Amino acid sequence: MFLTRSEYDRGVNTFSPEGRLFQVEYAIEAIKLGSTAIGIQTSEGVCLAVEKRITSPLMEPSSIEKIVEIDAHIGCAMSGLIADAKTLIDKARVETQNHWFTYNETMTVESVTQAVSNLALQRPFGVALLFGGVDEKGPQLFHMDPSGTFVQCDARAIGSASEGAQSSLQEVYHKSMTLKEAIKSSLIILKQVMEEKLNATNIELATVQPGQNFHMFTKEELEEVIKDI
Amino acid sequence: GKLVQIEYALAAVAGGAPSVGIKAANGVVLATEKKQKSILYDERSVHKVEPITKHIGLVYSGMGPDYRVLVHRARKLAQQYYLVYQEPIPTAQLVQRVASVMQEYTQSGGVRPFGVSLLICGWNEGRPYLFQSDPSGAYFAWKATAMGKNYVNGKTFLEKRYNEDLELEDAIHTAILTLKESFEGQMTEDNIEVGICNEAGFRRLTPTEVKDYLAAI
Amino acid sequence: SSIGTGYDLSASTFSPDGRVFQVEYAMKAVENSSTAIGIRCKDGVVFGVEKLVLSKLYEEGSNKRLFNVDRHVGMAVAGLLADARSLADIAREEASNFRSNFGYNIPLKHLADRVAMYVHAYTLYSAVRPFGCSFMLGSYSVNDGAQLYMIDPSGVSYGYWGCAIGKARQAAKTEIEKLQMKEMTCRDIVKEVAKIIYIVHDEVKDKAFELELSWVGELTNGRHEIVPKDIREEAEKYAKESLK
Amino acid sequence: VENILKTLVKSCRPYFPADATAEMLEEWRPLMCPFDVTMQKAITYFEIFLPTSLPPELHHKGFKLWFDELIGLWVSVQNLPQWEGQLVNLFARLATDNIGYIDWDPYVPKIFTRILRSLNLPVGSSQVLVPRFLTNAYDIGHAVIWITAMMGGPSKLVQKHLAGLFNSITSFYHPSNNGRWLNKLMKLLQRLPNSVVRRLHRERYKKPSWLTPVPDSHKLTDQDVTDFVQCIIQPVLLAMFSKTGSLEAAQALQNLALMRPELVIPPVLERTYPALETLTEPHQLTATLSCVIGVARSLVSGGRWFPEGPTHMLPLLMRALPGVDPNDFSKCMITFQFIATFSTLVPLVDCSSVLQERNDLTEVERELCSATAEFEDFVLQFMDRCFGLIESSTLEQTREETETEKMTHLESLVELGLSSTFSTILTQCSKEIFMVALQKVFNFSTSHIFETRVAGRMVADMCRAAVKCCPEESLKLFVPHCCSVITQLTMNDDVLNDEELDKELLWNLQLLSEITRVDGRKLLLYREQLVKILQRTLHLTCKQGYTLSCNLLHHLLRSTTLIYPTEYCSVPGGFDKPPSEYFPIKDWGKPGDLWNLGIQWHVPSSEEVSFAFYLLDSFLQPELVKLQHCGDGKLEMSRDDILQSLTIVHNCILGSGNLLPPLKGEPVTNLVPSMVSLEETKLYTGLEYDLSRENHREVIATVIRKLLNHILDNSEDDTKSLFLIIKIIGDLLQFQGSHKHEFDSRWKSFNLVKKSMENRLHGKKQHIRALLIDRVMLQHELRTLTVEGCEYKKIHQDMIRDLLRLSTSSYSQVRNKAQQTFFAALGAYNFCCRDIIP
Amino acid sequence: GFDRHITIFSPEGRLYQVEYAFKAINQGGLTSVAVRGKDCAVIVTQKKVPDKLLDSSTVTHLFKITENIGCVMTGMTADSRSQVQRARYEAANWKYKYGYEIPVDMLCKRIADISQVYTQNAEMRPLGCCMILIGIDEEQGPQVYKCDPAGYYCGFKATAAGVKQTESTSFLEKKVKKKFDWTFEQTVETAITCLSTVLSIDFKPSEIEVGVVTVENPKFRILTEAEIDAHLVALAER
Amino acid sequence: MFRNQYDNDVTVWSPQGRIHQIEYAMEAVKQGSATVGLKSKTHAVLVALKRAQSELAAHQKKILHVDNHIGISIAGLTADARLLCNFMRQECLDSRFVFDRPLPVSRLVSLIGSKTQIPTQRYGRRPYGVGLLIAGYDDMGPHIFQTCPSANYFDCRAMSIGARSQSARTYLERHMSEFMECNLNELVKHGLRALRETLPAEQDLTTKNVSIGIVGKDLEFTIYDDDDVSPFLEGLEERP
């Protein structure tokens, strides 16, 4: 409400007397104000759900994609402008193929998230990314912060209402959750933040399963899932 | 601000010692005041009027260390043209090149503009040439000019004295008169430095030659 | 009082008075540091420093303020240790370059001048802050006798028969002045240096200190080395008895 | 015209007829259509014409008729219209005029909300901006009058609301939360205390008048003033450290300190002592010191509610002594203002001996007497710090081609500040403290040689200040040494011919010239020595060294020929009293009394005027005879000789302008004709001119016209001589011993000192003696400067035609200077411009 | 405005930082006098050893730029050493590039040109030092030249630097105006008398340091304390 | 209101002869969670307490591998720690390639000190905000080292860094004499006890929140996490 400014805030590369870097903290918070994205990781599969928020009927819905395929086994959900994450998504895609050429093998999600973090370190970066894929360990989900910290999350929500979604996610999530149950829960949580009827344009749903590659649900496939709710 | 820095640089030139240039049909005369502050200073050690090439010479009003940087660049530019075209550089060409260097210092950041205004005399194609270059990098062609303290008063005095057809000898006398108007004390051969440009080329008048001209006046 | 003009902010600025404040401020950092004492004897130079032990948890020999910058030359430092360690690295490099290019050990007086110029370079530019350390370089050779030089944050280097850098610089200097370094051998000097360090140290202000002693001399065959522990223990016993 | 007309109607509004309000309402009530533009015209006329200054008995005839309608429109109009600003101004005037006759409380919550809305402070994440909110612009000045007017009375609603406004916006006052809102918030902080102090003065210390008095019931109680200071003190203290600069906070503190010193002075002092000590927080020192100047009058003389009072003054002055330094100009200037303000308020005399000899002193007074012992240490230390500033202020020319020969505005300001502060310290100093100071200045100036351009001028000013405080002793040490050094150096006789004089000779000539200005009677004892020095020095060829000698002649002539006040002291006839006859601690602070000011005035004596005429005959007349010969075809002289002679004449005219009578001539025949007389005003201004002696101004005029004719005809290129002739023609036409420019600077300085040292609550009745002496001198200067109705005359016409000839000269520099003098002359003589136009 | 903080033009047209650099030369508190005689050039500077502990040999303001060229440095000592190293490098480079020893006038110009760069560029502060170079020019005889922080250089019959430079220049001007060409003994006497008069020290041999170059022996020589004493004792008996 | 003109840059020196930005950076380590490192005659052990964003989140990794014989624990900005860790790994690999010798731990800590010093003396550079506890085994023996944002490094018998580190340091100093002769199991237990002192009374050490790394004469640096920490955790007595 009322302004609460301190001399050491907004100092760029200057440590505050406490030792915190305030300008970096403010930048990271602004980055996390994008559209809500929910990822839940289950033994059966990892599911990523995002809100498209298309402005006009004329616009083609496919052109706005918040879920992208880094590789057959890895997919990324982003909150905020696609343009901000374009360089980071490209780095991950180039690294996954560069790794394949050098070692003739798939790159684990943790190694892929570390490479994107290294680019972010080499500077806030302006995006929060959820990387979900099935690797040698199994189905795995990682969260990348605008700061560049990466942690494995059983269930994570990034975006404007992430804090509320995360509390809802905590109560619903259980280790034995099936992929079909996870899809329903993430969409139910997404509906609560959106406060809008779920439709194919409103939400984009993608899943990576151990046998299957990255799959983005088609309009008909999403419609069946939303109707069951 | 770069433009304000140029105005401030012009002020330093105005505070500088008076210098006079007169262009006559057979030659250009460049004259400057060189009053040593003390009897201790050696008059012959440093020269305000310097040759750039056989036919080109320059004088300045303003900061002397800044003037030296320009004279080295001007001498280099003259040599670079001579190597490529095997002919003495046209004076107008040299002034354009010298002006560009001054513009570079004003445009760049972290460097102050030069505080010296240059009067350049040259003889090419049997025609006398006199030019003035500003810290801004602007150059103008002048039949007669005065720079430094009391430049405005000196320029008006030049207007009455200057005649379109004048011999160099007469031009030297009026140039000395212009310096005399703003000279605080007695003028002596050591006190004033005079340089003449003619078909022969730029030469600094020897103190003995200056003494003769002063006696006539 | 305090100056808000901003003349004191950079070492690329001169105050209207004519002084570069940043070099003066850096010297104050050396003054707020444990005293380091160097005394030059006919045989050679002995350096003694009081190294405050901040914590019992730290191992002995941590945060050494005595460094070997060459086989024949050793350095005693005061002020910020990290800056002093950086200066030691430059001094070792200059000595290595001199040996490779000219084929002989760098003469102390030339090492001091080369290092002093590097410290001076920091004092003239906006981007780099002046060094916050002052050091004494000491060496001995048959051709050139014991040499002691002190370089300040400004970069002025002079040769001293006796020198002190730190909080008790004046107190140490007065104690060194009442001595006959020119006619005294190095072994006698070590006992005196320990005595001077004990007197300068303030127990109430600084709870604990470890005396670090190094010498380069005819006895060490022109090699900078820590004074042997047995000799150091004897000197400490003499110093403690003298303080009583 | 609009502003003059608005003030004229406002001036006649108190004296308008009783039934005027009803007729005014009938005239502009039809125009009041809210949609139409005529509503603004109707409100504008109502603000300018409706009379609020009507007696309480005739209130029904005026304010009662329209208050309900206009106030009702103001509450009803939620959109902010242009007229609302005019309407709020009218309400504020009505509230201040009728303090206890209007209820105000029903509308108080709405007014405070609208004023809070006016500040346009940002609140909330959205922070959307609505157009026309800026346009309403409730003025802070009128709003402050409205809030102060409704304050007081049985109801405390206004005070509670004011606390609420201050409590709501406190975060904005914090230095870190700076922004666009600060300008209005700072204005509120400065204006509100000033309004309250003015209201209390009207209620308590103002003489009764026809204007209705505040009702006793609605008069502000002591508790009401206590509540107001408590509400505004916390915002003011944050504003002291504001990035904007703290001028608004210092003014607010000055007014608050008069109302309640105990509540406001200690929090500022708690910050000031650390600010002096801190090395890492520079901004605090300037802000705290400026606030201490504001509360200075209250702390030194206020003991009833602030018993510690003056005890803090001596430690603060010593702590501020490191503040004078070459490195920081702003700290040096604020320190100089601090040292001067306290020094003028406090007699600097030691009374430590009194404690032992006499008991019955108050406990605070006993501490004050013990503190007085350190006063001598403070003055000597101030001189030591000042000597360092002068030593590091050397010009040090770095250009081989030219010498700067000039003072930058920043160095001029430090010289002015050092001279003023040193003069105040010495004037308040006891003679015993002064004598140790005199030796210190004499030794420093005598021991070293200084560059005349900058450092030498500062040393001379310190020496000149010492001479003024006690002239007989100071001149006795300074005049012989300077004269002896000059005579020994000039004995060669080739010195006169030499160009570039000995630096020691140049310094001693500057020192002798500056020390010369002082009471004329004191100069007479050394009259013979001064004339001998002038005779050798005036004709020195070097331009510097004849200028310094000419300055000596001007100062000597000015000192003996002008009326000026010598003492300039805080206590009349004080500081030389026998010990125990007068007790200084009682006179700390203490305003001077106009009736008992006892100003000592130097009026030119017969001996002084005779010496001035002898000097004019000895130097001006020989130059005049040579100049007359040069105007004729005789005694051809060099351009340098003409310039030297013109310098001698110009300095003589300036020095003796008061003595020389105004130019007189037959009036120009053709002029506008008036049946009524058109006579120039005559003011005595002291002195009385000598009719028998020939007027030098007339002889200068004839030679100057002849020289001008010769110079333009022959040496038209002599610009330096022509500039001097223009100055001489201006002095001949309009100089009576006072310079208009000098008066303007002194008037501005008087206003600047007055603001800091004025107690609004007690009024002009309490004012410092030094400022009062300055105001009397300003009145004398006003009389000499004001000349009106002067006849054009033939002599003036010829000089103006000569100015026009110079104004059309070949050299632009001569033309510019002549034109400024030409424009000045045209205004002085009646109907002069019409004659000049052809 | 940063006009005072960095070397950029002021409204008056003056660069304050160069003026502040001139103040730095006086901050050292030492004065140097150089006089040019008919056959020789001499430099005298006051040497003060504050502590008995300091080795006297190490503290010097007189340096050898080249075999025939020597200099006196007045000002910040570390800045002085920096200029001395630059001058020595420039002299060696000139002999390598052109095959003849650098003239003293040319060396003063090179150092002065480096000094101008500092005045033009904001990042580097001007060096607060004065260099007085003495050498014998084969063509023009003994030469004394002085370099300034402003980048100005000039040849002088006699010159002074330091706290007493203004007073020293005044004493030197009177002797130069009168008198005649001076012999080596007279030139050394003039410098010692000038420094003694301004500082009122009655210098013992240890207090003053003297450097000399002669037409007969062009190489720069620093006089030993005994040689300085011989000049001092001769001055006392006069 | 109390603004300091000298704290803006690492280059500026205060009139009191202190560089404020370096001191502010030194405080950054205290922001990070507590880490305890102690050594015996044959083994060096680092024990650290990790913290997690949420119950679902895995927990941040305090301990990292630098070489077979060298391991480090990070307190303070993680990004700075990753830059330092990458530098340390390159130096160690270079030493094995050029000399086929494990890089002595003392030489590595000196190189970190040199790298950290350059940001302190140069404009527009923030000093590193990470404090590192380094555990290594070399010919000299097991070594524990502490690095600071100031660029100073310390050889420590035992050290604790991070929030509430002082409580651990008081335990480490009290029982330091016992540490030299302790067996690996006892040495790890002592480190867990010191870390326990930092923990608030309500919170207790768990397999999820504790990370242990041990290097020894015959043991390459090994990081024990989750179930691996359970054998060490079971032995520890209940909180006093």
Swiss-Prot record, chain B:
Modification N6-acetyllysine occurs at: K54, K155
Pfam families: Proteasome, Proteasome_A_N
Gene3D superfamilies registered for this protein in UniProt: Glutamine Phosphoribosylpyrophosphate, subunit 1, domain 1 (3.60.20.10)
UniProt entry keywords in alphabetical sequence: Acetylation, Cytoplasm, Nucleus, Phosphoprotein, Proteasome
Main location: cytoplasm
Inducing or repressing factors: Down-regulated by antioxidants BO-653 and probucol. Down-regulated in response to enterovirus 71 (EV71) infection (at protein level).
PROSITE patterns registered for this protein in UniProt: PROTEASOME_ALPHA_1, PROTEASOME_ALPHA_2
Gene Ontology CC entries for this record: cytoplasm; cytosol; extracellular exosome; extracellular region; ficolin-1-rich granule lumen; nucleoplasm; nucleus; P-body
Post-translational modification: Phosphorylated on tyrosine residues; which may be important for nuclear import.
Effect of L94V: In a colorectal cancer sample; somatic mutation
Sequence positions bearing Phosphotyrosine: Y8, Y60, Y105
GO biological process, one term: proteasome-mediated ubiquitin-dependent protein catabolic process
Known partners and oligomeric status: The 26S proteasome consists of a 20S proteasome core and two 19S regulatory subunits. The 20S proteasome core is a barrel-shaped complex made of 28 subunits that are arranged in four stacked rings. The two outer rings are each formed by seven alpha subunits, and the two inner rings are formed by seven beta subunits. The proteolytic activity is exerted by three beta-subunits PSMB5, PSMB6 and PSMB7.
Homology family: Belongs to the peptidase T1A family.
Protein name per Swiss-Prot or TrEMBL: Proteasome subunit alpha type-2
Organism this protein belongs to: Homo sapiens
Chain's gene name: PSMA2
Swiss-Prot record, chain C:
Induction trigger: Down-regulated by antioxidants BO-653 and probucol. Up-regulated by bacterial lipopolysaccharides (LPS) and TNF.
Pfam name, any one: Proteasome
Modified residue annotations for Phosphoserine: S242
Transmembrane segments: none
Predominant subcellular localization, coarse grouping: cytoplasm
GO MF annotation list: ubiquitin protein ligase binding
Record PTM N-acetylserine, positions in chain: S1
Modified residues (N6-acetyllysine): K56, K205, K229
Biological process terms in GO annotation: proteasome-mediated ubiquitin-dependent protein catabolic process
Localisation per UniProt entry: Cytoplasm; Nucleus
Keywords assigned: Acetylation, Cytoplasm, Host-virus interaction, Nucleus, Phosphoprotein, Proteasome
Gene Ontology cellular-component terms listed: cytoplasm; cytosol; extracellular exosome; nucleoplasm; nucleus; proteasome complex; proteasome core complex; proteasome core complex, alpha-subunit complex
Highest taxon above the source species: Eukaryota
Segments forming a coiled coil: none
Family affiliation: Belongs to the peptidase T1A family.
Subunit structure, as described in the record: The 26S proteasome consists of a 20S proteasome core and two 19S regulatory subunits. The 20S proteasome core is a barrel-shaped complex made of 28 subunits that are arranged in four stacked rings. The two outer rings are each formed by seven alpha subunits, and the two inner rings are formed by seven beta subunits. The proteolytic activity is exerted by three beta-subunits PSMB5, PSMB6 and PSMB7. Interacts with AURKB. Interacts with CDKN1A. Interacts with MDM2 and RB1. Interacts with the C-terminus of TBXA2R isoform 2. Interacts with DNAJB2.
Listed name of the protein: Proteasome subunit alpha type-3
Record organism: Homo sapiens (Human)
Curated annotation (Swiss-Prot), chain D:
Entry annotated with the keyword Protein biosynthesis: no
Domain of life of the native organism: Eukaryota
Assigned GO CC terms: cytosol; nuclear speck; nucleoplasm; nucleus; spermatoproteasome complex
MF annotations from Gene Ontology: lysine-acetylated histone binding; peptidase activator activity; proteasome binding
GO BP, sorted A to Z: DNA damage response; DNA repair; proteasomal ubiquitin-independent protein catabolic process; sperm DNA condensation
HEAT repeat placement: 307-351
Chief location bin: cytoplasm
Keywords attached to this entry: Cytoplasm, Developmental protein, Differentiation, DNA damage, DNA repair, Nucleus, Phosphoprotein, Proteasome, Repeat, Spermatogenesis
Keyword Magnesium: no
Quaternary structure (record): Homodimer. Interacts with the 20S and 26S proteasomes. Component of the spermatoproteasome, a form of the proteasome specifically found in testis.
Domain notes: The bromodomain-like (BRDL) region specifically recognizes and binds acetylated histones.
Family: Belongs to the BLM10 family.
Protein name (record): Proteasome activator complex subunit 4
Organism of derivation: Homo sapiens (Human)
Residues of the full protein shown: 169 to 1006 of 1843
UniProtKB/Swiss-Prot annotation, chain E:
Main location group: cytoplasm
Endpoints of the signal sequence: none
Localization, UniProt: Cytoplasm; Nucleus
Residue list for modification Phosphotyrosine: Y152
Family annotation (PROSITE patterns): PROTEASOME_ALPHA_1, PROTEASOME_ALPHA_2
Positions of modified residues (Phosphoserine): S10, S56, S57
The protein's role, per its UniProt record: Component of the 20S core proteasome complex involved in the proteolytic degradation of most intracellular proteins. This complex plays numerous essential roles within the cell by associating with different regulatory particles. Associated with two 19S regulatory particles, forms the 26S proteasome and thus participates in the ATP-dependent degradation of ubiquitinated proteins.
PANTHER family xrefs: PROTEASOME SUBUNIT ALPHA/BETA
Name assigned to this protein: Proteasome subunit alpha type-6
Organism of derivation: Homo sapiens (Human)
Lineage: Eukaryota, Metazoa, Chordata, Craniata, Vertebrata
